[PDB]
Design a protein around this ligand. Structure first.
Ligand SMILES: O=C1N(Cc2ccc(CO)cc2)[C@H](Cc2ccccc2)[C@H](O)[C@@H](O)[C@@H](Cc2ccccc2)N1Cc1ccc(CO)cc1
Lengths: 99, 99
């Protein structure tokens, strides 16, 4: 759809059998989710944002449905204050920015 | 233009007589710029991100030209790793997200 940016761009995702909302974030390279129960094994990683860095667990080949669209990708799960869908998934659902 | 997200969406801005590049960031409510010389009054502020909180100075009513569009608004100056254009200005230049 077209989304204007007067309000935060939030969507629903289905992840790991659970429903969340997430911010669509052109500024994030990758996707970072609040702490979840995800099946399987993972690699610890660290990412930095404003303020500093967090330690995150990386899971590869995860199915996410965002709106009706499915994608498989890496997600990082960790102590973010909310769920961020970054460019690695944003390309898969064919999202563009226009002005 | 329309911009795809295989690459970080960077744009050139002019602020304060200085030329910089900035990230177009739909996840950010406000614009924060790296520390840089700006004339005027300001108020102190803190913002939170992934990682933590930073202290930032707030200037209102600052003219920025982003690509070839002029916009006027609050900018927060501070210790960010990148200059971020957030939704306060993206709305002014008509930026839309589309998928
Ligand atoms: O830290 C933020 N990251 C950090 C980040 C880094 C990496 C990933 C995964 O690869 C995900 C998120 C981005 C901006 C940024 C990029 C690179 C270096 C430094 C900063 C993000 O793109 C921006 O949207 C918000 C996302 C967000 C928003 C609110 C709370 C937590 C996270 N932030 C923080 C931010 C908050 C407020 C403003 C102004 O209102 C600006 C930025």
């Amino acid at each position: 759809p077209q989304v204007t940016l007067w309000q935060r761009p939030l969507v629903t995702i289905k992840i790991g059998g659970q429903l969340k909302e997430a911010l669509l974030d052109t500024g994030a390279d990758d996707t970072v989710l609040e702490e979840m129960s995800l099946p399987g094994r993972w690699k610890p990683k660290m990412i930095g944002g404003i303020g500093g860095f967090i330690k995150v667990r990386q899971y590869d080949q995860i199915l996410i449905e965002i709106c009706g669209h499915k994608a498989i990708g890496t997600v990082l799960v960790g102590p973010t204050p909310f769920n961020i869908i970054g460019r690695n998934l944003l390309t898969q659902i064919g999202c563009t920015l226009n002005f």
